[PDB]
Design a binder for this molecule. Structure first.
Ligand SMILES: Cc1cc(/C=C/C#N)cc(C)c1Nc1ccnc(Nc2ccc(C#N)cc2)n1
Ligand SMILES: O=C(O)c1cc2cc(F)ccc2[nH]1
Ligand SMILES: O=C(O)c1cc2cc(F)ccc2[nH]1
Ligand SMILES: [Mg+2]
Lengths: 415, 556
């Protein structure tokens, strides 16, 4: 009820980001939402003395037909202070990734009950644009804790733990972690039991609340089934020249990751100038060298550690037929997690929708294991991505990304 | 009197850590001083300014300019220094409405709101920073000190605060009269509607009444400006629009300036005049920016200019947007990385046109350019109409499916249909996914001495075919491309090619059909003539036979 004092970072002005173009359907949805938010006092109109701006758009959360307003606070979040006043941080629960059912809850609407510091409200300015700029854009600022701002969970954390006090010590086994507007609850129980303690969780937030529009949702994960990618070599009875060349190519690549990888006996099999499709029998020295490389590739990578002070980097490769591979790392050749997707949802004809959904799932994984989002290297032209990714976004957070314009030859080795 | 609602002031601050201006007042002639005294006395009568005491330490210079061909002077307060110290504001005039997004209107009336501007008060705490001084006659008395009570002309915050003040005034009238459109530009309000002229003129009088609640008067003698409107370089008519007249000048010799303004006019005309091209004319300004130098115009530039003069012979108009009908966008390839498009709803009546130029880069192809042109039209269409148009593209559906399924990047074009108007966009070659049985296998390699720039390129094959070519003024990367070219030159219509060049693969795997390197273009020309080509990569210096043999030949 009393505002917490909040400041930007030293020598840093507020955000002045351009509101990207919005379709007619999203503008009308935002006007209807912001009109209601203005009536409820969450936002207020502002004048021209506020020069700051943060982009806004509208999405549809997974499995619903109602528009949700999403503010892209990425630039603001960079510019606001880092909050270690009460707690140096929330030590990320390493047990969340080890429960076998984790449900994601949208509790962002609970932030609207806490007022925002009056001096900081001007930095949350956003604009509802008009089609063809025919009418002046509608300018608002936040009076309460905004969804998507990194200061909202920090300021509201004091209130959140007290709401969850009756539920957590009744169910001590259960892992609860908050990231932005999301609440992840992990359990080792059976799913039929799981969903009703999910709604048992929902009991507490509406009970205190007196209505949240998206609190009734549930995003079911299974971090226990989450698959790893180790390096595997083909098992063949007949090897062509091309087969051995591809094998030596992959093994030369793995030698950057694993020390003792040798390709000398296998390369000797190529001695001569032979047709690519000609079958080459494996020598013994080559078979032993191949088996020794297999044994090496069954062990983990040496010297692989996570550092919370460094950024997580996520690379993605398009493998075709709706399949995608990805790797999360902080140092080159030191993969913290690797994976592969294929079950991409309702986009067998849309590459960009598949990639957008891959980014969201990878970010969700990164939040569960380390508690922060990675910076993506996207295999897509910048203009293509920025035109369409908002049409398939269903998460309340937005990560950072850069674009890959040169085809990686490492794609050959991850399929 | 009738009480009027006051216009709430906008709180204005100086930039953090800055103080108000303290600029010297220039000496003025005795004739100029009198003129400013009479002018400022009238402004004070109207409440625009007020005389202040000597404690105010701020000052802004004042000048007197002779209104040309008249005995009347005019004032000018040079707020350039105060503007540097005034905070930034939100500027709503950021983006012009494009005429192609407007709606047809039976009636569009104009109302003057020039008197309403100085009914907008300036923030009381900021007025001290607007202080200025009229010098006294012979400098024998203290100069007359004034400060502003209203938004001063030339001040940084005056446009934004005026627009926002009028916006807040018009909001309830527009919301409760949804059958009209209101738009503000400078000191005028433009009201359009589809209402009968009786009901329309009634709405105008209702707007005049509504404006008097704030005490803002509008001239009864209705505005002289009438359709068509000359506005932001356009001509606006009730049911059509166009650009203001584009006249390409006759010139026996052209300057960098003349070409800069020529391309600017052509760019402006390209939004309604279909097929405007500017590549050959823009090539003449590459890198150089000496304003006055003359450049001989190539024969390619005279053809492009003559084509543009033929496009601009007679006027062309665009229609206004009908929200009840779909948007259609059609694109054509013009050559040399040039693309032109039209956006329409009914056949043969464009809402607008446009063009797209290939980005400068090493390598590209037609499919990539068509994709980029689609994304530019899509974004422009979201701005102007709030929706993506249906596309008609000169590319076969089968060609597109082959491209995006095998392209290493994710790519997507919105809903589109094939239009059979040449030149059609096509794929010129497609590499094999597996090695070819029966095809000769060429192991290529190249190397070059980094100092002497001498190198070799060549190949060895499984049938014993060999070649090594000595090269001069080349690099390691050039010899690797030259070696691939030699294999394509000397092979049949199906060939397997083995190389160790990650550089050459990064190029070919990007699938270009035209490059800034002629060496890559020769390789592309060879690829187009082949039936089957399989390109295989191996790492270098690993004893890989075939690659090891030719490496020793070319690095010798
Ligand atoms: C942007 C704009 C510029 C001017 C013009 C400013 C000036 N000078 C006048 C108006 C009224 C508007 N606003 C809108 C809004 C929606 N449809 C239209 N259509 C429309 C506008 C003018 C004419 C005409 N003649 C016909 C249709 N105008
Ligand atoms: O719909 C319009 O024409 C319109 C809406 C509106 C709102 C304002 F605040 C000012 C002018 C406007 N014109
Ligand atoms: O659709 C095309 O233009 C196209 C498909 C295709 C397949 C090939 F194998 C070779 C050239 C091609 N061009
Ligand atoms: Mg070599």
């Amino acid at each position: 009820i009393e505002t917490v004092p909040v400041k930007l970072k030293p020598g840093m002005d507020g955000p002045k980001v351009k509101q990207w173009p919005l379709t007619e359907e999203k503008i009308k949805a935002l006007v209807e939402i912001c009109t209601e938010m203005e009536k409820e006092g969450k936002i207020s109109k502002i004048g021209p003395e506020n020069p700051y701006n943060t982009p806004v758009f509208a999405i549809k959360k997974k499995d619903s037909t109602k528009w949700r307003k999403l503010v892209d606070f990425r630039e603001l979040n960079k510019r606001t202070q880092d909050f270690w006043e009460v707690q140096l941080g929330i030590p990320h629960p390493a047990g969340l990734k080890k429960k076998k059912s984790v449900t994601v809850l949208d509790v962002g609407d609970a932030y609207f009950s806490v007022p925002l510091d009056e001096d900081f409200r001007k930095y949350t300015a956003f604009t509802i644009p008009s089609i063809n700029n025919e009418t002046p854009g509608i300018r608002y600022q936040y009076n309460v804790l905004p969804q998507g701002w990194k200061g909202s969970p920090a300021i509201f954390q004091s209130s959140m733990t007290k709401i969850l006090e009756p539920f957590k010590k009744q169910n001590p086994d259960i892992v609860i972690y908050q990231y932005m507007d999301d609440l992840y609850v992990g359990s080792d129980l059976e799913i039929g039991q799981h969903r009703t303690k999910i709604e048992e969780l929902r009991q507490h937030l509406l009970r205190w609340g007196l209505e949240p529009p998206f609190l009734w949702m549930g995003y079911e994960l299974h971090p226990d089934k989450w698959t790893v990618q180790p390096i595997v070599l083909p098992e063949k009875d007949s090897w062509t020249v091309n087969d051995i060349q591809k094998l030596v190519g992959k093994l030369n690549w793995a030698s950057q990751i694993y020390p003792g990888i040798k390709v000398r006996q296998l390369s000797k099999l190529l001695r001569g100038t032979k047709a690519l499709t000609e079958v080459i029998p494996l020598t013994e020295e080559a078979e032993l060298e191949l088996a020794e490389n297999r044994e090496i590739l069954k062990e983990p990578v040496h010297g692989v550690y996570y550092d919370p002070s460094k950024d997580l980097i996520a690379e993605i490769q398009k493998q075709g037929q709706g399949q995608w591979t990805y790797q999360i790392y902080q140092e080159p050749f030191k993969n913290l997690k690797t994976g592969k997707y294929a079950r991409m949802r309702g986009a067998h004809t849309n590459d960009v929708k598949q990639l957008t959904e891959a980014v969201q799932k990878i970010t969700t994984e990164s939040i569960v294991i380390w508690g922060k989002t990675p910076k993506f290297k996207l295999p897509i032209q910048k203009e293509t991505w920025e035109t369409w990714w908002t049409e398939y976004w269903q998460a309340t957070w937005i990560p950072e990304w850069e674009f890959v314009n040169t085809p990686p030859l490492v794609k050959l080795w991850y399929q | 009197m009738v009480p009027i609602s006051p216009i709430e002031t906008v709180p204005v601050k100086l930039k953090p850590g800055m103080d108000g201006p303290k600029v010297k007042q220039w000496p003025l002639t005795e004739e100029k001083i009198k003129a400013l005294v009479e002018i400022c006395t009238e402004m004070e009568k109207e409440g625009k300014i007020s005389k202040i005491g000597p404690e105010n330490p701020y000052n802004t210079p004042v000048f007197a300019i002779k209104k040309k061909d008249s005995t009347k002077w005019r004032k000018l307060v040079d707020f350039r220094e105060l503007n540097k110290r005034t905070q930034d504001f939100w500027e709503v005039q950021l983006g012009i409405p494009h005429p192609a997004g407007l709606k047809k209107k039976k009636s569009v009336t104009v109302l003057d709101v020039g008197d309403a501007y100085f009914s907008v008060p300036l923030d009381e705490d900021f007025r001290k920073y607007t202080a200025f001084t009229i010098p006294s006659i012979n400098n024998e008395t203290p100069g007359i000190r004034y400060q502003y009570n209203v938004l001063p002309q030339g001040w940084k915050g005056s446009p934004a605060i005026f627009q926002s003040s009028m916006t807040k005034i018009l909001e309830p009238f527009a919301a409760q009269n949804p059958d009209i459109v209101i738009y503000q530009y400078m000191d005028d309000l433009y009201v359009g509607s589809d209402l009968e002229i009786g009901q329309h003129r009634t709405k105008i009088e209702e707007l005049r009444q509504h404006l008097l609640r704030w005490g803002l008067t509008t001239p009864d003698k209705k505005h002289q400006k009438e359709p068509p409107f000359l506005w932001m370089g356009y001509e606006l008519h009730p049911d059509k629009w166009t650009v203001q007249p584009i006249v390409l000048p006759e010139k026996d010799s052209w300057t960098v300036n003349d070409i800069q303004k020529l391309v600017g006019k052509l760019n402006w005309a390209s939004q309604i005049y279909p097929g405007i091209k500017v590549r050959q004319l823009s090539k003449l300004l590459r890198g150089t920016k000496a304003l006055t130098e003359v450049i001989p115009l190539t024969e390619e530039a005279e053809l492009e200019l003559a084509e543009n003069r033929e496009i601009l012979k007679e006027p062309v108009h665009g229609v206004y947007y009908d929200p009840s009908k779909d948007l259609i966008a059609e694109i054509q390839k013009q050559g040399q990385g040039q693309w032109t498009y039209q956006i329409y709803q009914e056949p043969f009546k464009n809402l607008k046109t446009g063009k797209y130029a290939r980005m400068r880069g090493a390598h590209t192809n037609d499919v990539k350019q068509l994709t980029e042109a689609v994304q530019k039209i899509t974004t422009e269409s979201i701005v102007i109409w709030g929706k993506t148009p249906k596309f008609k593209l000169p590319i076969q559906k089968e060609t597109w499916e082959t491209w995006w399924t095998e392209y290493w990047q994710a790519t997507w074009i919105p809903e589109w249909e094939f239009v059979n108007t040449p030149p059609l966009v096509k794929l010129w070659y497609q590499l094999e996914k597996e090695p070819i049985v029966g095809a000769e296998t060429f192991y290529v390699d190249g190397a070059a001495n980094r100092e002497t720039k001498l190198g070799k390129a060549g190949y060895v094959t499984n049938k014993g075919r060999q070649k090594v070519v000595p090269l001069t003024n080349t690099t390691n990367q050039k010899t690797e491309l030259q070696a691939i070219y030699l294999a394509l030159q000397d092979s049949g219509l199906e060939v397997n090619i083995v190389t160790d060049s990650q550089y050459a693969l990064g190029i070919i795997q990007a699938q270009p059909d035209k490059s800034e390197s002629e060496l890559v273009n020769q390789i592309i020309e060879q690829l187009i003539k082949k039936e089957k080509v399989y390109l295989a990569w191996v790492p270098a210096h690993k004893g890989i036979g075939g690659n090891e043999q030719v490496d020793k030949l070319v690095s010798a």
